[PDB]
Design a protein around this motif. Structure first.
Motif, PDB file in Angstrom:
ATOM      1  N   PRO A  78       0.744  -1.317  -0.174  1.00 22.27           N
ATOM      2  CA  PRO A  78       0.011  -0.025   0.187  1.00 22.27           C
ATOM      3  C   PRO A  78       0.783   1.291  -0.027  1.00 22.27           C
ATOM      4  O   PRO A  78       0.421   2.299  -0.743  1.00 22.27           O
ATOM      5  N   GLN A  93      -1.292   5.225  -0.832  1.00 19.18           N
ATOM      6  CA  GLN A  93      -2.629   5.257  -1.110  1.00 19.18           C
ATOM      7  C   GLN A  93      -3.269   6.392  -0.020  1.00 19.18           C
ATOM      8  O   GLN A  93      -3.122   6.282   0.865  1.00 19.18           O
ATOM      9  N   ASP A 147      -9.122   6.525  -1.775  1.00 23.28           N
ATOM     10  CA  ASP A 147      -9.735   5.824  -3.221  1.00 23.28           C
ATOM     11  C   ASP A 147      -8.692   5.831  -4.157  1.00 23.28           C
ATOM     12  O   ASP A 147      -7.925   4.875  -4.462  1.00 23.28           O
ATOM     13  N   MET A 148      -8.081   7.410  -4.608  1.00 20.07           N
ATOM     14  CA  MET A 148      -7.003   7.337  -5.388  1.00 20.07           C
ATOM     15  C   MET A 148      -5.847   7.029  -4.848  1.00 20.07           C
ATOM     16  O   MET A 148      -5.611   7.089  -3.642  1.00 20.07           O
ATOM     17  N   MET A 149      -4.714   6.941  -5.667  1.00 18.16           N
ATOM     18  CA  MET A 149      -3.276   6.718  -5.184  1.00 18.16           C
ATOM     19  C   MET A 149      -2.560   8.052  -5.412  1.00 18.16           C
ATOM     20  O   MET A 149      -2.692   8.588  -6.705  1.00 18.16           O
ATOM     21  N   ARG A 177      -2.347   2.410 -16.857  1.00 17.72           N
ATOM     22  CA  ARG A 177      -3.785   2.513 -16.353  1.00 17.72           C
ATOM     23  C   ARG A 177      -3.873   3.108 -15.180  1.00 17.72           C
ATOM     24  O   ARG A 177      -2.863   3.904 -14.852  1.00 17.72           O
ATOM     25  N   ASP A 178      -5.096   3.119 -14.558  1.00 18.41           N
ATOM     26  CA  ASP A 178      -5.239   3.680 -13.094  1.00 18.41           C
ATOM     27  C   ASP A 178      -4.575   3.156 -12.016  1.00 18.41           C
ATOM     28  O   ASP A 178      -4.461   1.869 -12.105  1.00 18.41           O
ATOM     29  N   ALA A 179      -3.916   3.742 -10.980  1.00 21.70           N
ATOM     30  CA  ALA A 179      -3.185   3.100 -10.190  1.00 21.70           C
ATOM     31  C   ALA A 179      -3.969   2.370  -9.230  1.00 21.70           C
ATOM     32  O   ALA A 179      -5.184   2.558  -8.750  1.00 21.70           O
ATOM     33  N   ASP A 180      -3.241   1.183  -8.805  1.00 27.87           N
ATOM     34  CA  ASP A 180      -4.058   0.082  -7.696  1.00 27.87           C
ATOM     35  C   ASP A 180      -2.908  -0.825  -7.314  1.00 27.87           C
ATOM     36  O   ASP A 180      -2.380  -1.358  -8.273  1.00 27.87           O
ATOM     37  N   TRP A 181      -2.580  -0.565  -5.912  1.00 27.63           N
ATOM     38  CA  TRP A 181      -1.599  -1.193  -5.110  1.00 27.63           C
ATOM     39  C   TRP A 181      -1.536  -2.870  -5.379  1.00 27.63           C
ATOM     40  O   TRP A 181      -0.746  -3.554  -4.974  1.00 27.63           O
ATOM     41  N   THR A 182      -2.701  -3.360  -5.432  1.00 28.11           N
ATOM     42  CA  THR A 182      -3.017  -4.659  -5.829  1.00 28.11           C
ATOM     43  C   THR A 182      -2.674  -5.438  -6.934  1.00 28.11           C
ATOM     44  O   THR A 182      -2.821  -6.609  -7.297  1.00 28.11           O
TER      45      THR A 182
END
Lengths: 102, 404, 108, 287, 73
Positions: free
Chosen positions: A8, A27, A30-32, A73-78
Motif C-alpha cells: 500500500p 494510497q 480511493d485514488m493513489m 492504467r489507473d493506479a492500484d497497489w493490488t
C-alpha cells in the motif's frame, strides 16, 4: 519501466536520465498519490495517478531537458507488477508523445 | 466563506465539557483545563488550515496557482541558457584551446567555451560560448576579457556575424499573477484581437505587446491614420531567433488586414518596408501578409528629494527600488509597457512599498529620447503622458537622489 | 511510576465534589488498569490488533481444554506498564458461571 | 521464516551465468572512501565439470586477438553480486558489488572441489589509456568532470574547493587508473575521492551526499562503541546502508553514543550455508 | 602472450616479491630529469611550453607519447 511491488505505501530511488530520482507511492482513500523528488530536492507533492496523464504536470519542473513518468492504467497497489507498469520516458520520446496527445 | 472566526472557539469546548461530563471546574489550574485548552489550540489549526486550502482565487494563491494557470495557459515559462555561436578569438600559433575556458564580459559575463579547439597557422579560430547562469543576458559588440588563458591566446573577439539566442528567466508567482490576465487565448479558428494579443504574449522573449482594431473606417480613436480596416500590432520583442515564428504566431491567429504603421503613419520603425514574408502555411495556402512594428525606444530619468527617514537607509537601495517597478517585478503594478505613462505619483509612491519609514518631501520625473544628454534642471514635471508608439525604460544611472 | 484518571464501576470519568479530575498514583492505578485491560475484548483495539481477551472464541464458544482462556487472560494481565508477574490463576467453572481469580505482583 | 538470497552473476560472451543461493557460496566485500579499489573474495563449491570448464577457462589473464577490436569485455569479464531476503515469496534483493575477476585458485580437494576468486571494481582501466588531453588552467570541478568523462562514469562533486584554479593538473598520467589518485592527492585529507559501484564521488569528509535519506538504525547485532574516529557497530543485512550516507543511531546498552554519523567504511560477510550474514559499519560525526 | 600488465607469475608466492613489485612501481612514478623540447616561448616572461622527448613503453613494446607542459619557466 520501474520495478514495483504490491504494497500500500512504498518508495523507490533510482538513477534515470543522467540524474537521481526518488518516487514515493502511497494510497490516499480511493485514488493513489505520489510524491516526486529529484536530486534530494522536492518537485511536486501529492500528485494523483491516472492512466496516461504524466505525474509532472507543471511546465517548468518536468523538463528543460529531463524526462517524465506515465502510468498505463489507473493506479492500484493490488495489481502492481501484475499487468500494471510504470514507464519513464526520456526527453525526446516524451516531447513526441505530448505533441501526439493533442 | 473567506475568513475564519476564532474568538468564540474556546467557549465551544469550555461548554462542551460542561454539558458533557458535569457542571464543575472548567478552570485553569485543574486537569480539565489542559484538555479544554488543547481541544481549542487544535481546533484553531483546524479552522485556519481548512480555509487556507480553499483559495480558488487567482490572487492570494501560491504554488497551486500553477494549476489555475494551466487551466487555460498550457505553459508559464521555462529555464534555458543564453547559448552562443560563431565566436572567434585572437591567438597565436599551434595553441591547444581547452574546454571551460572562461571569458567574462564586463556586465557579468562568466561565459565558458562549449567545445574544444586548436589554434591554426592563421592565428584566429572559432569557439562556442555558453552562459554560466540560466537568465537572459546579452553580449557586448566587442570582446572584453579572457580569464582562462595560456598567455598566447591574446583576447576573445566578438564580431557582427555571430548569433545571440535569448533564453527565459525561471518564474515569479507575483509575475504570474500579472501575465495571467493577458495570456488567455481562445478556442475557435483563433481570429480575435484578444486571441492575437494572448497568443503573441506567450512567445518567448516578448516583453509586451499592443494590438488595436478599427471596425469603422477612415481613422480610429487609438493612434493610427491610414487604411480603412487595419490591424496595428506593436510587438516589443528583445529578439526573434525564430524570426519567422514571431511572424508565424501572428499569422496563425490572424484574419483581416495587415498594415505596417496603420499603413501610412510616420515616425514608427517597422520591421522592414516590404512584407514580413512568413515561410509557409500548412493548409496549402501561399499567403504571406504579416506586418508589425517595434516601439520607438526612449530613455528615462527620475529624481527625488527625500528626508532622512527613521532608519539608516542607504542611498543605493532607493535606486534598486524603482528599477523593479520599471521592469514590472512587483506584485500589482504591470511595469513599463507600450504607452506606459511615466508618472512621479505612480513611481515615487511605490518606492515606499519596499523601504517604508522615510518621508518623501518631493519627487519629479521626466524623460527624453534615448542616447541624448540629460534635460535641463527645470525640465522636470510630475507626469509624462505617453503615446502608444513607444515605451520608456529606466536604468540605474538615470536616478539621482538628494537627502535634503 | 504510573498514573491514571479515576473511574467508577462504570468506566466513566468520576469527579469529586470539587469536580477535580484526579491523577491516581500507583497501586490503585494498577488495579484500575488491570480491570480495564481484562475487559477490553479482542478485535476492538485499533492500531494494535491481536490485543485483548478472546471471550467469543475461547470462553463463550464450546471449548475442550480451557488452558487457552488462562493463557489469554494471563497475557492481558501482562502488557500492563507495571505488572511484574502473576502469582495465581484458578479458573473454577463451577455452576453456570466461569469463575476467574487472579493475584498479580507489581514493582511496588 | 524468511530465507536469504545470494546471487552471483557472470557475463560470459554468449550470455549471463547465474550461481544461485542453492549452492555453497561465501563472499567477503570491503568498501571504503579511498582511491584503492574495492575487493571481493568468493568461495564457490560444488561446481561440476561442465561449469568448471565453462567458467575457469575464461580467467586467462593473457591477451588474445592482439588486434583488439573494441575494448572492455574483450579483456576481462564482469561479475555482479546481489544479496537480500525472501519472505512469503516477496523479495528485497539489492546489488552490492560490481567488478572483474583478477586472481584464481583452488581451495578444497575432492570429494568437494571449491575455488576462490578475487574481483576488483573498475579494474578495466588498468589497461585502457588516455586519449583526451586534460585542461591546462581550470577549476577543480572541470578537472573532475573531465576525469568522469574519460573513465566513463556518472559523477557527483560537492566540495568547498569548487572554485580553485589548478595549473597542469594531470599532465603526467599514464593510464586511466591514476586519474583517481590525482583527484585525491590535491586536497587530502579533507577531500575524499572514491569510486563506488559505477559512480565517481568527490566530497568533503563530513558531508552526507543525500541529506533526506538518513537511515534510522535501532537494532544492532554488534554493540555500538566509540572507536577514536566516530562510532563503529554491526548489523544484519540492511540494504539501506551505503557509503557516504548517513545513519541515525539509537542504542540501549550505550545511549551516550546516540547521534547522526556519516558512513566511512563497510564490510560484508554473506554466506548461503554458514552463520555469517552481516554488515560492519564505521562512522564519523556529521557536520 | 601480452599479459595485460607488467605482472610476473612468481609474484603473490611470498611477501617479499609483492614488496619488490610495489617498490618498483613507487620508484617509477618518481620523476626527476629527462630531455625535452620547446614548442612555444615568449621572451618577455620566461615561460615556455615543453614537450618531453622520451616516450612510454607498453606490454606490446609500443610507444606512447608523453604530454605537453605549459608555462614552464
Amino acid at each position: 519501466k520501474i520495478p514495483l511491488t504490491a504494497v500500500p505505501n512504498q518508495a523507490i530511488s533510482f538513477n534515470a536520465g543522467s540524474s537521481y530520482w526518488k518516487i514515493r507511492l502511497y494510497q490516499n482513500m480511493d485514488m493513489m498519490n505520489a510524491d516526486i523528488s529529484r536530486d534530494g530536492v522536492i518537485v511536486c507533492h501529492g500528485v494523483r495517478c491516472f492512466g496516461g496523464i504524466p505525474l509532472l504536470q507543471y511546465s517548468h519542473q518536468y523538463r528543460p531537458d529531463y524526462g517524465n513518468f506515465v502510468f498505463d492504467r489507473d493506479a492500484d497497489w493490488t495489481l502492481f507488477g501484475d499487468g500494471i507498469n510504470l514507464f519513464y520516458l526520456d526527453g525526446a520520446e516524451f516531447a513526441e508523445y505530448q505533441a501526439l496527445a493533442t | 466563506v473567506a475568513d475564519t472566526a476564532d474568538v468564540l472557539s474556546d467557549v465551544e469546548a469550555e461548554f462542551r465539557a460542561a454539558l458533557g461530563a458535569n457542571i464543575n471546574l472548567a478552570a485553569s489550574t485543574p486537569q480539565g483545563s489542559l484538555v479544554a485548552a488543547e481541544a481549542i489550540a487544535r481546533s484553531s489549526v483546524m479552522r485556519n488550515e481548512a480555509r487556507i486550502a480553499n483559495t480558488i482565487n487567482p490572487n492570494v494563491s501560491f504554488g497551486t496557482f500553477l494549476d489555475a494557470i494551466c487551466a487555460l495557459m498550457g505553459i508559464e515559462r521555462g529555464s534555458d541558457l543564453s547559448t552562443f555561436g560563431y565566436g572567434v578569438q585572437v591567438t597565436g600559433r599551434s595553441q591547444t584551446r581547452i574546454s571551460t575556458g572562461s571569458r567574462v564580459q564586463t556586465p557579468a559575463g562568466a561565459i565558458f567555451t562549449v567545445m574544444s579547439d586548436v589554434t591554426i597557422p592563421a592565428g584566429g579560430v572559432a569557439t562556442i560560448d555558453i552562459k554560466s547562469q540560466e537568465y537572459g543576458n546579452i553580449p557586448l559588440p566587442v570582446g572584453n576579457l579572457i580569464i582562462i588563458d595560456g598567455t598566447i591566446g591574446w583576447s576573445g573577439a566578438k564580431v557582427i556575424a555571430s548569433t545571440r539566442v535569448d533564453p527565459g528567466s525561471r518564474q515569479m508567482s507575483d509575475a504570474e499573477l500579472k501575465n495571467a490576465r493577458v495570456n488567455r487565448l481562445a478556442i475557435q479558428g483563433r481570429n480575435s484581437t484578444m486571441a492575437i494579443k494572448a497568443y503573441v504574449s506567450a512567445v518567448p522573449n516578448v516583453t509586451s505587446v499592443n494590438v488595436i482594431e478599427n471596425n469603422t473606417g477612415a481613422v480610429q480613436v487609438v493612434n493610427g491614420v491610414s487604411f480603412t480596416l487595419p490591424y496595428a500590432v506593436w510587438v516589443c520583442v528583445a529578439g526573434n531567433p525564430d524570426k519567422q515564428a514571431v511572424a508565424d504566431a501572428l499569422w496563425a491567429a490572424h484574419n483581416g488586414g495587415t498594415p505596417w504603421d496603420y499603413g501610412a503613419t510616420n515616425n514608427g520603425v517597422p520591421v522592414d518596408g516590404p512584407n514580413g514574408v512568413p515561410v509557409r502555411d500548412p493548409a496549402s495556402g501561399r499567403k504571406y501578409v504579416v506586418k508589425w512594428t517595434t516601439p520607438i525606444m526612449y530613455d528615462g530619468y527620475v529624481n527625488v528629494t527625500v528626508q532622512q527617514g527613521s532608519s539608516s537607509v542607504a542611498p543605493e537601495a532607493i535606486q534598486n527600488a524603482v528599477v523593479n517597478y520599471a521592469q514590472g517585478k512587483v506584485e500589482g503594478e504591470e511595469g513599463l509597457v507600450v504607452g506606459a505613462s511615466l508618472s512621479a505619483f505612480e513611481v515615487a509612491g511605490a518606492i515606499a512599498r519596499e523601504i517604508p519609514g522615510i518621508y518623501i518631501k518631493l519627487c519629479q520625473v521626466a524623460c527624453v529620447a534615448a542616447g541624448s544628454p540629460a534635460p535641463a534642471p527645470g525640465d522636470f514635471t510630475s507626469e509624462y503622458v505617453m503615446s502608444a508608439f513607444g515605451q520608456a525604460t529606466i536604468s540605474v544611472g538615470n536616478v539621482r537622489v538628494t537627502f535634503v | 511510576s504510573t498514573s491514571t484518571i479515576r473511574t467508577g464501576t462504570n468506566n466513566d470519568i468520576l469527579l469529586d465534589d470539587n469536580g477535580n479530575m484526579v491523577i491516581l498514583r500507583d497501586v490503585e492505578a494498577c488495579a484500575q488498569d488491570v480491570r480495564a485491560a481484562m475487559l477490553m475484548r479482542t478485535g476492538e483495539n485499533i492500531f494494535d490488533v491481536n490485543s485483548g481477551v478472546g471471550y467469543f472464541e475461547y470462553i463463550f464458544s464450546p471449548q475442550k481444554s480451557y488452558d487457552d482462556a488462562r493463557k489469554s487472560i494471563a497475557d492481558a494481565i501482562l502488557s500492563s506498564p507495571d505488572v511484574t508477574g502473576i502469582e495465581q490463576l484458578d479458573i473454577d467453572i463451577t455452576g453456570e458461571v466461569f469463575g476467574v481469580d487472579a493475584k498479580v505482583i507489581t514493582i511496588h | 521464516m524468511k530465507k536469504r538470497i545470494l546471487r552471483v552473476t557472470f557475463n560470459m560472451p554468449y550470455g549471463p551465468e547465474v550461481i544461485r543461493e542453492d549452492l555453497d557460496v561465501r563472499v567477503r566485500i570491503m568498501k571504503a572512501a579511498l582511491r584503492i579499489q574495492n575487493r571481493a573474495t568468493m568461495e564457490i563449491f560444488g561446481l561440476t565439470t561442465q561449469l568448471r570448464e565453462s567458467l575457469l577457462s575464461q580467467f586467462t589473464a593473457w591477451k588474445h586477438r592482439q588486434r583488439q577490436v573494441g575494448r572492455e569485455d574483450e579483456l576481462m569479464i564482469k561479475v555482479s553480486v546481489e544479496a537480500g531476503y525472501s519472505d512469503q515469496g516477496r523479495e528485497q534483493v539489492s546489488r552490492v558489488f560490481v567488478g572483474e575477476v583478477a586472481i584464481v585458485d583452488i581451495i578444497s580437494p575432492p570429494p568437494d572441489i571449491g575455488i576462490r576468486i578475487q574481483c576488483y571494481t573498475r579494474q578495466i582501466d588498468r589497461t585502457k589509456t588516455i586519449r583526451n588531453m586534460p585542461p591546462a588552467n581550470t577549476t577543480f570541478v572541470k578537472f573532475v568532470e573531465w576525469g568522469a568523462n574519460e573513465m566513463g562514469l556518472n559523477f557527483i562533486c560537492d566540495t568547498s574547493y569548487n572554485d580553485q584554479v589548478l595549473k597542469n593538473p594531470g599532465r603526467s598520467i599514464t593510464v586511466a587508473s591514476a586519474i583517481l589518485a590525482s583527484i585525491q592527492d590535491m586536497y587530502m585529507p579533507d577531500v575524499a575521492a572514491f569510486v563506488d559501484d559505477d559512480i565517481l564521488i568527490v566530497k568533503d569528509r563530513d558531508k552526507v551526499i543525500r541529506p533526506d535519506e538518513v537511515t534510522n538504525v535501532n537494532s544492532f547485532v554488534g554493540i555500538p562503541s566509540w572507536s577514536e574516529w566516530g562510532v563503529e557497530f554491526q548489523c544484519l543485512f540492511e540494504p539501506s546502508i551505503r557509503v557516504a550516507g548517513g545513519v541515525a543511531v539509537e542504542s540501549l546498552m550505550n545511549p551516550s553514543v546516540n547521534g547522526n554519523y556519516v558512513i566511512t567504511a563497510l564490510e560484508y560477510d554473506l554466506a548461503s550455508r554458514d552463520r555469517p550474514f552481516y554488515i560492519k559499519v564505521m562512522g564519523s560525526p556529521a557536520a | 602472450n601480452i599479459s595485460l600488465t607488467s605482472a610476473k607469475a612468481p609474484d603473490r608466492t611470498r611477501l617479499i616479491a609483492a614488496l619488490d613489485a610495489r617498490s618498483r612501481r613507487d620508484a617509477l612514478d618518481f620523476e626527476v630529469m629527462i630531455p625535452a623540447q620547446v614548442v612555444q616561448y615568449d621572451r618577455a616572461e620566461n615561460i615556455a611550453t615543453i614537450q618531453p622527448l622520451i616516450t612510454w613503453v607498453d606490454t606490446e613494446h609500443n610507444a606512447v607519447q608523453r604530454h605537453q607542459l605549459v608555462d614552464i619557466p
